[PDB]
Design an enzyme around this catalytic site. Structure first.
Site, PDB file in Angstrom:
ATOM      1  N   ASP B  25       0.784  -1.231   0.000  1.00  0.00           N
ATOM      2  CA  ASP B  25       0.000   0.000   0.000  1.00  0.00           C
ATOM      3  C   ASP B  25       0.819   1.286   0.000  1.00  0.00           C
ATOM      4  O   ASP B  25       1.291   1.713   1.052  1.00  0.00           O
ATOM      5  CB  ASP B  25      -0.891  -0.049   1.243  1.00  0.00           C
ATOM      6  N   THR B  26       0.971   1.914  -1.167  1.00  0.00           N
ATOM      7  CA  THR B  26       1.749   3.147  -1.256  1.00  0.00           C
ATOM      8  C   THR B  26       1.081   4.316  -0.543  1.00  0.00           C
ATOM      9  O   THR B  26       1.741   5.311  -0.228  1.00  0.00           O
ATOM     10  CB  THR B  26       2.006   3.568  -2.717  1.00  0.00           C
ATOM     11  N   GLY B  27      -0.220   4.195  -0.296  1.00  0.00           N
ATOM     12  CA  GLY B  27      -0.949   5.254   0.385  1.00  0.00           C
ATOM     13  C   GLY B  27      -0.803   5.243   1.900  1.00  0.00           C
ATOM     14  O   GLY B  27      -1.164   6.213   2.573  1.00  0.00           O
TER      15      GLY B  27
HETATM   16  O1  LIG Z   1      -5.736   4.859   4.937  1.00  0.00           O
HETATM   17  C1  LIG Z   1      -4.654   5.170   4.432  1.00  0.00           C
HETATM   18  N1  LIG Z   1      -3.627   5.646   5.222  1.00  0.00           N
HETATM   19  C2  LIG Z   1      -3.740   5.734   6.673  1.00  0.00           C
HETATM   20  C3  LIG Z   1      -2.578   5.428   7.488  1.00  0.00           C
HETATM   21  C4  LIG Z   1      -1.884   6.476   8.203  1.00  0.00           C
HETATM   22  F1  LIG Z   1      -2.309   7.733   8.130  1.00  0.00           F
HETATM   23  C5  LIG Z   1      -0.704   6.157   8.983  1.00  0.00           C
HETATM   24  C6  LIG Z   1      -0.222   4.801   9.047  1.00  0.00           C
HETATM   25  C7  LIG Z   1      -0.907   3.757   8.340  1.00  0.00           C
HETATM   26  C8  LIG Z   1      -2.088   4.073   7.559  1.00  0.00           C
HETATM   27 CL1  LIG Z   1      -3.070   2.602   6.557  1.00  0.00          CL
HETATM   28  C9  LIG Z   1      -4.445   5.117   2.926  1.00  0.00           C
HETATM   29  O2  LIG Z   1      -5.314   6.076   2.277  1.00  0.00           O
HETATM   30  C10 LIG Z   1      -4.669   7.340   2.013  1.00  0.00           C
HETATM   31  C11 LIG Z   1      -4.712   8.299   3.186  1.00  0.00           C
HETATM   32  C12 LIG Z   1      -3.516   9.010   3.585  1.00  0.00           C
HETATM   33  C13 LIG Z   1      -3.537   9.844   4.755  1.00  0.00           C
HETATM   34  C14 LIG Z   1      -4.746   9.978   5.520  1.00  0.00           C
HETATM   35  C15 LIG Z   1      -5.942   9.284   5.124  1.00  0.00           C
HETATM   36  C16 LIG Z   1      -5.933   8.446   3.960  1.00  0.00           C
HETATM   37  C17 LIG Z   1      -4.759   3.692   2.466  1.00  0.00           C
HETATM   38  O3  LIG Z   1      -3.948   3.351   1.308  1.00  0.00           O
HETATM   39  C18 LIG Z   1      -6.212   3.472   2.078  1.00  0.00           C
HETATM   40  O4  LIG Z   1      -6.436   4.052   0.766  1.00  0.00           O
HETATM   41  C19 LIG Z   1      -6.631   2.021   2.104  1.00  0.00           C
HETATM   42  O5  LIG Z   1      -6.378   1.435   3.407  1.00  0.00           O
HETATM   43  C20 LIG Z   1      -5.988   0.044   3.323  1.00  0.00           C
HETATM   44  C21 LIG Z   1      -7.138  -0.907   3.009  1.00  0.00           C
HETATM   45  C22 LIG Z   1      -7.137  -1.664   1.776  1.00  0.00           C
HETATM   46  C23 LIG Z   1      -8.267  -2.481   1.430  1.00  0.00           C
HETATM   47  C24 LIG Z   1      -9.405  -2.551   2.313  1.00  0.00           C
HETATM   48  C25 LIG Z   1      -9.414  -1.810   3.548  1.00  0.00           C
HETATM   49  C26 LIG Z   1      -8.281  -0.989   3.903  1.00  0.00           C
HETATM   50  C27 LIG Z   1      -8.113   2.043   1.847  1.00  0.00           C
HETATM   51  O6  LIG Z   1      -8.878   2.573   2.658  1.00  0.00           O
HETATM   52  N2  LIG Z   1      -8.590   1.435   0.696  1.00  0.00           N
HETATM   53  C28 LIG Z   1     -10.004   1.391   0.366  1.00  0.00           C
HETATM   54  C29 LIG Z   1     -10.434   2.475  -0.594  1.00  0.00           C
HETATM   55  C30 LIG Z   1      -9.965   3.832  -0.726  1.00  0.00           C
HETATM   56  C31 LIG Z   1     -10.541   4.686  -1.740  1.00  0.00           C
HETATM   57  C32 LIG Z   1     -11.567   4.177  -2.615  1.00  0.00           C
HETATM   58  C33 LIG Z   1     -12.034   2.821  -2.497  1.00  0.00           C
HETATM   59  C34 LIG Z   1     -11.457   1.983  -1.483  1.00  0.00           C
HETATM   60  C35 LIG Z   1     -11.760   0.551  -1.178  1.00  0.00           C
HETATM   61  C36 LIG Z   1     -10.497   0.137  -0.386  1.00  0.00           C
HETATM   62  O7  LIG Z   1      -9.463  -0.290  -1.275  1.00  0.00           O
END
Ligand SMILES: O=C(NCc1c(F)cccc1Cl)[C@H](OCc1ccccc1)[C@H](O)[C@@H](O)[C@@H](OCc1ccccc1)C(=O)N[C@H]1c2ccccc2C[C@H]1O
Lengths: 99, 99
Positions: B25-27
């Site tokens: 997960d690059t996000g």
């Molecule tokens: O949630 C995320 N990051 C949070 C985070 C952090 F702030 C510190 C340490 C770890 C993590 Cl995971 C990331 O999001 C970006 C973000 C950055 C900063 C603040 C808020 C969001 C993470 O990659 C986020 O995009 C991703 O979380 C992991 C995940 C993957 C699959 C299922 C559940 C959880 C997510 O929520 N994906 C969902 C999504 C997003 C958009 C549209 C549709 C869908 C369906 C799923 O695939």
């Protein structure tokens, strides 16, 4: 281009004639942007993240430029903490993970 | 390897003599895994994503084998819906985004 991950992979996108910053997110199935106005009708959708679910508005066939690459696809709009470019558009620009 | 994004980029990881499936997960800034037992002291932390915040336990200097590559870094443990390999570890295996 090749983007390392020592810092958030933020890029500039252009949508509706406006420039915004968004995160290239391989963990996001879809693309979701912060509240904004888009053309046409929308459909309801629920997406689940680490903290739970949020309701978003789904707009289809939306033109969006990512790092200069033009894409046309589904864009979700809702209470997301940041603009997220998900796999649906990452595949359109031919983005891959490498190591 | 080169991983396309047509499907979720899931890989097998080994942590504490356990094999688990995780999402590249690059996000995600950090790595977060579902509830499990890890050795050492930990600190409480709150992380926010889509849907809101969740409380996790922060472990440091944890060794993880990602798709065959050794990597050391912080690992957060908590009620995440899926195991996530974040940037803190992706950088260590030399993972980059390319297009
Ligand atoms: O949630 C995320 N990051 C949070 C985070 C952090 F702030 C510190 C340490 C770890 C993590 Cl995971 C990331 O999001 C970006 C973000 C950055 C900063 C603040 C808020 C969001 C993470 O990659 C986020 O995009 C991703 O979380 C992991 C995940 C993957 C699959 C299922 C559940 C959880 C997510 O929520 N994906 C969902 C999504 C997003 C958009 C549209 C549709 C869908 C369906 C799923 O695939």
């Amino acid at each position: 281009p090749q983007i390392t991950l020592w810092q958030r992979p933020l890029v500039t996108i252009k949508i509706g004639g406006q420039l915004k910053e968004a995160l290239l997110d391989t963990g996001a199935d879809d693309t979701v942007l912060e509240e904004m106005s888009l053309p046409g009708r929308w459909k309801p959708k629920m997406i689940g993240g680490i903290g739970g679910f949020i309701k978003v508005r789904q707009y289809d066939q939306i033109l969006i430029e990512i790092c200069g690459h033009k894409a046309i696809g589904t864009v979700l709009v809702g209470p997301t903490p940041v603009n997220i470019i998900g796999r649906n558009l990452l595949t359109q620009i031919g983005c891959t993970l490498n190591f």
